[PDB]
A paper describes a structure:
The majority of mammalian poly-LacNAc is synthesized by the alternating iterative action of β1,[name] ([name]) and β1,4-galactosyltransferases. [name] is in the largest mammalian glycosyltransferase family, GT31, but little is known about the structure, substrate recognition, or catalysis by family members. Here we report the structures of human [name] in complex with UDP:Mg2+ and in complex with both UDP:Mg2+ and a glycan acceptor, lacto-N-neotetraose. The [name] structure conserves the GT-A fold and the DxD motif that coordinates a Mg2+ ion for binding the UDP-GlcNAc sugar donor.
Residue numbers in the entry:
A (entry chain A): 57 to 72, 90 to 394
B (entry chain B): 52 to 71, 91 to 397
The structure:
Amino acid sequence: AYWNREQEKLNRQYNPISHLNYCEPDLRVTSVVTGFNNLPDRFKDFLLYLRCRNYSLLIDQPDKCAKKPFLLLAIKSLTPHFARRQAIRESWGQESNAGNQTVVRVFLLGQTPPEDNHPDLSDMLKFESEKHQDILMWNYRDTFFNLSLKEVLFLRWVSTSCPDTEFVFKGDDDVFVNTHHILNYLNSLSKTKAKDLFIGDVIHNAGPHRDKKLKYYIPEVVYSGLYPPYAGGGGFLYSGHLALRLYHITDQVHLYPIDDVYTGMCLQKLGLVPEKHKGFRTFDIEEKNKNNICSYVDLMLVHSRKPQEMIDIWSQLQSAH
Amino acid sequence: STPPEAYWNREQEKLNRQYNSHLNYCEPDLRVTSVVTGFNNLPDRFKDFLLYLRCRNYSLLIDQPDKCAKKPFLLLAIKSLTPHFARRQAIRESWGQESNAGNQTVVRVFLLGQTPPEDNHPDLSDMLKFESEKHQDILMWNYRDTFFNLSLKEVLFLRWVSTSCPDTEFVFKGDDDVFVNTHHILNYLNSLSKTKAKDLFIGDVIHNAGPHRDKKLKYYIPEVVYSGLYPPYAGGGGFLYSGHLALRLYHITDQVHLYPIDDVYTGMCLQKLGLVPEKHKGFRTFDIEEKNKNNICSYVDLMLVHSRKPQEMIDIWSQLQSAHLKC
Ligand SMILES: *[C@@H]1O[C@H](CO)[C@@H](O[C@@H]2O[C@H](CO)[C@@H](O[C@@H]3O[C@H](CO)[C@@H](O)[C@H](O)[C@@H]3O)[C@H](O)[C@H]2NC(C)=O)[C@H](O)[C@H]1NC(C)=O
Ligand SMILES: *[C@@H]1O[C@H](CO)[C@@H](O[C@@H]2O[C@H](CO)[C@@H](O[C@@H]3O[C@H](CO)[C@@H](O)[C@H](O)[C@@H]3O)[C@H](O)[C@H]2NC(C)=O)[C@H](O)[C@H]1NC(C)=O
Ligand SMILES: O=c1ccn([C@@H]2O[C@H](COP(=O)(O)OP(=O)(O)O)[C@@H](O)[C@H]2O)c(=O)[nH]1
Ligand SMILES: O=c1ccn([C@@H]2O[C@H](COP(=O)(O)OP(=O)(O)O)[C@@H](O)[C@H]2O)c(=O)[nH]1
Ligand SMILES: *[C@@H]1O[C@H](CO)[C@@H](O)[C@H](O)[C@H]1NC(C)=O
Ligand SMILES: *[C@@H]1O[C@H](CO)[C@@H](O)[C@H](O)[C@H]1NC(C)=O
Ligand SMILES: [Mg+2]
Ligand SMILES: [Mg+2]
């Protein structure tokens, strides 16, 4: 498989044409990937531009972490998702300073360019960024298969602009997160379990989906074998110290079309295994418990909820029993 | 003794006898708790619909008073909710663009109410005000924007046509999740006789419909609320009518009680005018066949298709501009 063979080459370089800033189309893939011409467009773009990751930040918040945070909330989003971001601001993503444990929030965006037929929402996004001061936007095409790029550029921003946050929560903009429970959990940790914390909805021994109709389909010609253990499904929680170690190792791992698999590949290279926490309810909760606020007291996150549902749950949680 | 009709029917019978306050009484009408059988067991949307039925004098908070300074040929009026920024912007850029080919002016408004914090809506109100200042195409009224208040959205829009755009030749009223082939609409309007034009009303018209009685369905209506059948009505995403008829509809709205389903209410008003809306097969409110969805020639001969995402509307519109070369 192509990714496996290219990654083996990387392994030989680090453990005896750039893979990091070559940003012309890599036309060699049209010769060496069998059946390249019949691959879906997302795979063609992924393969042609694999070796380019030096994209610039167009909208930054460089002093976001001027007061060293206890918890950084970093939420993946797309330009048009205004209601999702605003509901997060008002509910579980509120910034705070309780107990002098500061919580800060950023949203992680790429471009939604006109060539992909996106409406031009640059005026609204600028208004939102000036009002709320929490948008980070980079100059790459925001797509599902560039989410591992979103991951690497975010880790690069943690390294440059938020290196001292004690913990990081990285998650999606359609999950409900019980941030109080997350904070209670983090404050229970020993110094030892904290320095390399990485928890979430972790699966072992998964492999690529081979059914061409599935969202996470990966052809055999792109990747072979099984996936490393990885946390997926909507969000995960880890230490800022480990964030720096993860950023440093990203140069040694080729980007991958599925972001959460990529993060698992970086952890494996560090010799770490992410740990499952049952409070990450990435397949929702039982239908019978969905209208009982007590079901939300004992979890970390649940996928998926609409903007109004996030605000409704958060408001009810504040008076739970 | 013949069985009593449902609550809506009995109030409409009263209205009919008065014409042959129900308009600005805005306290809760507590009489409904006594006369609507099983009121206490109704879903909340019905309780609110019934308690505030007699109130329709809500203020315009964001207006575009000069929208029709030049008498339009076609007014595009698109129902939307505050958070739908991407839908509105895709419509502006594609099929809802304002234009003036052949001096037949096309102008656009989006029709909004409030999305208040009490309904757990995120606060996007400052953004909306900025959007209105940038694009000058938002009409916003001070009422709670909900599915069961869409007939209120209809009446307040028709009131605005009467006060602020009474001379538009035609009106298209539609949803913000449809693709509209506005070029085909303009050619259709330019094909009409003077007489067919004065009372044009076309869309995806259903005859012989009645209220859905299954409590799990979106358009469920209890038997204690409405009894009997629906008049013919155009539904499904948009419909097209003359500005002259728009004024006749506005006048008759005082004579028809509001109704939880906006397109049925419009059908009720047309019936009271003695008109029957006409089906046009180009209103593809259940979409087109899967095998045709990626052939731009399928969009050339339709009026509208439900439903399309913002990126899909822009893609279709872009390809449509050169479809004459392939179709
Ligand atoms: C991930 O994001 C990157 C950066 O935005 C995307 O790279 C860009 O991809 C487009 C093609 O989709 C490239 O445009 C094409 O360039 C060729 C060669 O000059 C030109 O002939 C085509 O007409 C078209 O303009 C663009 O150069 C490239 N930009 C870079 C590398 O900076 C990439 O597509 C995204 N990947 C995925 C999986 O979405
Ligand atoms: C359609 O829009 C109207 C106008 O916004 C909505 O009327 C408003 O409905 C709410 C209840 O949902 C009323 O608030 C309630 O008032 C009572 C006392 O008056 C109070 O005890 C409740 O706690 C709550 O505050 C509000 O007064 C009423 N406003 C007006 C101007 O009539 C109506 O609910 C919407 N209808 C539907 C079907 O959504
Ligand atoms: O091009 C993209 C597609 C998705 N997302 C974000 O990625 C997350 C997961 O998207 P989705 O819910 O569609 O994935 P799923 O839960 O189906 O795996 C959400 O925060 C989306 O806003 C993104 O940032 N860029
Ligand atoms: O409270 C509401 C709910 C919906 N809509 C608009 O009503 C139209 C139809 O909504 P929907 O697509 O959900 O209805 P359906 O196609 O299922 O009948 C769309 O323009 C929505 O933006 C609205 O203006 N206010
Ligand atoms: C990355 O670096 C290369 C070489 O310095 C440069 O040519 C390219 O433009 C950069 N890519 C981007 C997207 O900035
Ligand atoms: C409608 O008019 C009545 C009486 O003039 C007034 O009491 C009421 O507040 C008005 N309704 C609204 C929503 O402004
Ligand atoms: Mg999701
Ligand atoms: Mg619809």
